[PDB]
Amino acid sequence: MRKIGIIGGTFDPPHYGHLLIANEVYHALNLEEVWFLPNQIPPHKQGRNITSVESRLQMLELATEAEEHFSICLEELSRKGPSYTYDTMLQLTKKYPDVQFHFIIGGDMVEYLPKWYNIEALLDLVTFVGVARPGYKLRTPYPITTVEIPEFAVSSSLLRERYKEKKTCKYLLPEKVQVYIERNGLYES
């Protein structure tokens, strides 16, 4: 009966956009906590740069360390290459039979839910939480919860480009993440 949120992604890098979404859902739905679920990234086909699991995990640590109700879930990182959400949620529900998982997704992704691997069985494992801007209404045959979220146009691709151009990203992600990015020379070609 414990209400726990799940927010998945590569977190490459983690930013205030992610934290804002996790916080809003935590508060809207009265969750006990939100788990950040870092995805595996397959090796690059052409051997080009991917952000190491080590780096993504430490940025997540730094991003969430000051937040009481945010935790990191290592389930997806703990085996294989990438996992279907079904596979991950199967293991978490078996592992935490007392938890009601609330799986947070962007509004734009809602229309594509019928294409998710093994969707019908996943619907028995999680409650989906669709996030949408004020003024936006989500539509789906599936029983999802909608949460309205403020606009802050920060994205990982934005931040990556700023670091490439040796610009600062003050005010866009936690200070400690920024220091890590700068010290490890991340995202600079």
Add this chain to the structure above:
Amino acid sequence: MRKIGIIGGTFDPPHYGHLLIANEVYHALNLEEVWFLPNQIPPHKQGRNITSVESRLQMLELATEAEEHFSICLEELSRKGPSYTYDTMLQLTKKYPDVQFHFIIGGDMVEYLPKWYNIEALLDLVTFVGVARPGYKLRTPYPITTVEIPEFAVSSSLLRERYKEKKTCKYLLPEKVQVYIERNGLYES
């Protein structure tokens, strides 16, 4: 091989945002045509409304009628249930052996490509075209083509809330589609 774009989605309703994306990719990559690929929607779990196949197809016709280089592909819509993209593209590849398919996806979708059903096999059937805001880049282990398109922010979920509130959506989607929506009482739920 003929270069053909694929833009998939529920188009519920189709609007200027979709046409802008298709058109930009069409011009950027010198495609012969862009085929809009309407998805199937499973029946509502709680007996509520989904927009019919008939309605979605006719809005799509009205949205694309003026453009020679825009067509509608019925591969998914003619089926009884939803299709994985891999299964659709395998059939299309089979049916059109001289076509190189360019599969258009939103920038936000790129991060989650490793979770798509049969992604490795699908990579051998299509070239993905990711849409980035101008000056921004997409990060993925997969070989993808990037097309820059401004984020125009018009969305189906905005238009639907507007129709529920009994507003017009003039200047946000083709005139003909707005008429069809109003005349048929779509999006009032």
